[PDB]
Amino acid sequence: TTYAFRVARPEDVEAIAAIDGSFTTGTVFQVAVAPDGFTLREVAVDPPLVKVFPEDDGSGDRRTYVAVGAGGAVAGFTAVSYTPWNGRLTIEDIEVAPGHRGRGIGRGLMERAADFARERGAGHLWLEVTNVNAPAIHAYLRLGFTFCGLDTALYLGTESEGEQALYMSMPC
Amino acid sequence: TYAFRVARPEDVEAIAAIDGSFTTGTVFQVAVAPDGFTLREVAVDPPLVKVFPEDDGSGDRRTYVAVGAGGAVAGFTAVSYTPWNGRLTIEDIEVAPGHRGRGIGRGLMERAADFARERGAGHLWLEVTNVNAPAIHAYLRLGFTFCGLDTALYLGTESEGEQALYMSMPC
Ligand SMILES: NCCC[C@H](N)CC(=O)N[C@@H]1[C@H](O)[C@@H](OC(N)=O)[C@@H](CO)O[C@H]1NC1=N[C@@H]2C(=O)NC[C@@H](O)[C@H]2N1
Ligand SMILES: NCCC[C@H](N)CC(=O)N[C@@H]1[C@H](O)[C@@H](OC(N)=O)[C@@H](CO)O[C@H]1NC1=N[C@@H]2C(=O)NC[C@@H](O)[C@H]2N1
């Protein structure tokens, strides 16, 4: 019980904001576009890519969960979003604080997302991940997500141009 | 044979009747691997009948209309601009059942392209179900290529079993 999980309250919103999800990676997922399909291959990059997410990301059925340590600091969060149309719970964000990884916070937050999904009658969880976010992709694969598609054009004209939006899902 | 203009309130009821329901002897089959996605056009026998659902789950917006002699709508396109990624979404483009093979598709998409360059768009983008081979062939003809897909988009919908394919082209 190193970490407790609960619905986020107003005092958590400011702590959530500071966990921006910025990462370093020695690998990226390269997207190869053919006329008849798309291939993902993990490739080493030297020196390591430093990715800071932009301040402008282009943005009852909503919910934010938070992982809290003994001193009351937010160690992680997930913001989820339900669309009844296709029974999709979108994992809009999931982050673990830099110094709190390898302690089952990721799994715990996703388990709370899954609880909300079954509460709303969702058929699948779904998330967007940039092809350069190899650490997150490995984390999502570990938690049972698989690639369900991509949009190689989504980040065109954005601060993230050169990257591809990869889509992952899992049933519940 | 056909003139193009911005759609007016009296066109809304005619636009509604043009749902784009089709028959096809082929579909684009989606193969999911752990490391990617493959699209292969495959014959289906007997022909697939696709009726689009009434519930589709839905300055920078614009609707164009193709008009014949006698002033009847022969087709339309609704487009949508997002400055964030300079994307003009072709939200819908349909030609009336009896008016195909007359360059209405091309004409409507040319009006979409004019709006894109007017707004400074970097690319056009559309969604098409994998079973809509006729539309996919039309879009390929007009210069669109596949830029991705979402095999999970239609889960829990009337269209479950189909995959949402994404196509784009630069301006
Ligand atoms: N920020 C922490 C991570 C947040 C989550 N993982 C969600 C995510 O992936 N957001 C990414 C990320 O903010 C960043 O992408 C890169 N590569 O940095 C920017 C591009 O600059 O695009 C975002 N994507 C978007 N898709 C949405 C869309 O289609 N319509 C509406 C609008 O919401 C769109 N924004
Ligand atoms: N009439 C011709 C179609 C013209 C266009 N290309 C529009 C299109 O493709 N609509 C399809 C089509 O209505 C149908 O799909 C099948 N397979 O029939 C249903 C599945 O029931 O899903 C629609 N898609 C959607 N995507 C959107 C989304 O992501 N969020 C919000 C909302 O807008 C969503 N709706």
Residue numbers in the entry:
A (entry chain A): 7 to 65, 73 to 185
B (entry chain B): 8 to 65, 73 to 185
From the manuscript:
Here, we report a noncanonical FAD-dependent enzyme Orf1 that adds a glycine-derived N-formimidoyl group to glycinothricin to form the antibiotic BD-12. X-ray crystallography was used to investigate this complex enzymatic process, which showed Orf1 has two substrate-binding sites that sit 13.5 Å apart unlike canonical FAD-dependent oxidoreductases. One site could accommodate glycine and the other glycinothricin or glycylthricin. The resultant product is no longer sensitive to aminoglycoside-modifying enzymes, a strategy that antibiotic-producing species employ to counter drug resistance in competing species.
Almost all ST BGCs encode a ST-resistant N-acetyl transferase (NAT), a self-resistance enzyme, that acts on STs. Given the sttE gene encoded in the Streptomyces lavendulae BCRC12163, the gene product was expressed and subjected to probe its drug resistance scope. We then determined the structures of SttE in complex with ST-F or glycylthricin with CoA, of which crystals were packed in space group P1 and P212121 and determined at resolutions of 2.42 and 2.36 Å, respectively. Both the extended strand β7 and β-hairpin between αA and β2 establish the substantial protein interface promoting protein dimerization, where D164 specifically interacts with R101 and W139 via electrostatic interactions.
